[PDB]
Structure formats: structure tokens, C-alpha cells
Symmetry: none
Amino acid sequence: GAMDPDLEATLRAIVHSATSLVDARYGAMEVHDRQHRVLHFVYEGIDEETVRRIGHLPKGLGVIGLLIEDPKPLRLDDVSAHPASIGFPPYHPPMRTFLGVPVRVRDESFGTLYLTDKTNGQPFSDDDEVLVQALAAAAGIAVANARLYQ
Amino acid sequence: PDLEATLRAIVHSATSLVDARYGAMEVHDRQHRVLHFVYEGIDEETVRRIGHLPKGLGVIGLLIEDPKPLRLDDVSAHPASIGFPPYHPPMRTFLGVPVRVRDESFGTLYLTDKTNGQPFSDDDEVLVQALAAAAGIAVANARLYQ
Ligand code: HEM
Ligand code: HEM
Ligand SMILES: [Ca+2]
């Protein structure tokens, strides 16, 4: 089923603010179930034709998986060089710099929020990490309270 | 609290990320009585001096009547401005947005006095709207629970 419309609008707004404020080329959020299964995927920075070419949606594998087992921020300067990296699928844009955080309320996990390819070729900053943590915390509030509502 | 802690956390994110001196959120019922008023940036002694809680008048009243973002270089210069009560800190720059869901608006999240005298930006407005939207879902759920 589709996400609740208020939740969807809120999460897209959060992904947009995060992407815009950290000057990332790409931004995404996975919304999960209680067993960390991806239920919804919202993103920005990739055109419709490229989305069609890629075809299958992400399973939340690789480095994204680390945000769950180690629920703290992860910054990398060459994401697909990490040993946990599963690699990009055919037609997916290549990406290098990465900033990811879990979306949580207290210890409860609701998904992941991540950004790639800071526009200046630079690594994501400490300030970028703090901003993205705060926005992920808001996303957690949104998911937790939409769920309860539904 | 539950809700109150949530709203305080959202006010803290808005105020700290935009780098404003003061931040607040008012949540009202359908007859505009204040149900929650949470804020940061003002010391307890000054709070005691102001005395009474805001009623949601002036520029905040405007935001309740017509819920859409309002950014001002000088809040006291707006035609709807009612002025501050005695002992309230002086405040100049202003950004306020509604706390809502599609069905209903519940409150207003607002910031004043961005650091270094600067006006709030379009980026600040967009960020505060995203934070407000999360608070809007929390308020909507609290009204089901209550
Ligand atoms: C636009 C924002 C996006 C960002 C920031 C992003 C980021 C990433 C990153 C960093 C990886 C590699 C993880 C690793 O190697 O461990 C990855 C993999 C992957 N991406 Fe994306 N991606 C985006 C959009 C998309 C879209 C729109 C699709 C599908 C239409 C997609 C499908 C996939 C798939 C299938 C994988 C393989 C791993 C998995 O299934 O989880 N991505 N993505
Ligand atoms: C620290 C965060 C705060 C912010 C950002 C803030 C901001 C404002 C603003 C923008 C106005 C509008 C004045 C106008 O229309 O010209 C106002 C008025 C007012 N404020 Fe505050 N304020 C804060 C804290 C407080 C506190 C702690 C109190 C008392 C406990 C208070 C009591 C009032 C009252 C009584 C008014 C008159 C209008 C009304 O009743 O709504 N304020 N404030
Ligand atoms: Ca550092």
C-alpha cells in the first residue's frame, strides 16, 4: 500500500531539506519495518528515465545495512570501496562520498537517511552530520506517529 | 510528557540548525486556546518577569488565521504586530510556519533573531517547514490518543 499522504509529504520534505542543506547531489530515505525490512524508498536527484533503467528498488544492502547494526552516523569518502559495499547495480549513477544515519526514536529503528556526492567534491562535514542527524530524528518522529495514527 | 518532549525536540532542532537566538511552538485547540507552549533561548527569571503566557495574538494570530510561512526583517514593523508585553526580550527578525497535516493545522513553529543580525533565508524557511511537518504528525496522533 502507499504511505500515508502526510507521512509521505513529510519524509520527502525532510529528504529535500537534507539534500539541499548539505549540498548533496543525491539524497534518499528507506522506511523499514521492525525487523529492518525496507517498505518504502524515497529519493531525489535521479531523473525518471534513469530510475526506469535501474529498474529494481534497493533492498537496503551493503553499507546501508551498517547504519542498522551500528546505529550511529557513517561518513565515507569512497562508499563502494568499503568492504561491506555490495556495489551499484546496472545504470545506477556512480557515487563516492556518503553520509548516512539511522532514523530512530529512542532505541526503536524506523529506517535510514543518506546522502551522496557533496557537490564541491569534498567530504561531508561534521556540521552536515549534525544536521542530518537532526533531520533523521524528525523523520523518526514522523514515522513513529504516523504508524500509531494508522 | 510524551508530546511535549517531542515538540521541545523539534523546537530545539529548528532553533539550533537555523542558528536563531529564540524558538517557540504554540499548539492551540479549535477555539484557539493554547494547549502547549514550548520555547527555548530565554532564562527562567525573564520568563517569570513576563508573567502571562502568549494568547496567540499579533503576528502569531495572523499565522493561525492564515497558515502559511511568514518571514520578516522586523516583526514589529508588520501591520498585524501587536507588540511585546513588558519584560519580554526584544526581538527583530522572524520566521514562523504552521504545524499541521493536510486535514487541519494545530499550531505555529517560530524563530526570532537569527545570529549576527541576519534575516531568515528561504533555506531556513524550507528546513523549518520540514521540521514542523513532523511535529504536525505527532500532534495529529496525540489527538487520536486523547
Ligand atoms: C537518488 C538517491 C540515491 C542514493 C543516494 C543511492 C545510494 C546508493 C548507494 C550508496 C548504494 C551502494 C551501497 C553499497 O555499495 O553498499 C546503492 C545501491 C543500490 N541502489 Fe541506490 N541510491 C539512490 C537511488 C536509487 C534508485 C532511484 C534506485 C532504484 C530505482 C536505486 C537502486 C539501488 C540498488 C538496487 C542498489 C543495490 C543494493 C541494494 O539493493 O540495496 N538507488 N545506492
Ligand atoms: C523564547 C521564545 C519566544 C519567541 C520566539 C517569542 C516571540 C514572540 C513574538 C514574535 C511575538 C509577537 C509580537 C507582535 O505581534 O508584535 C510575541 C508576543 C508575545 N509573547 Fe513571546 N516569544 C517567546 C517567548 C515568550 C515567553 C516565554 C512568554 C511568556 C511566558 C511570552 C509571552 C508573550 C506575550 C504575552 C506576547 C503578546 C501577544 C500574545 O499574547 O500572543 N513570549 N512573542
Ligand atoms: Ca570532526
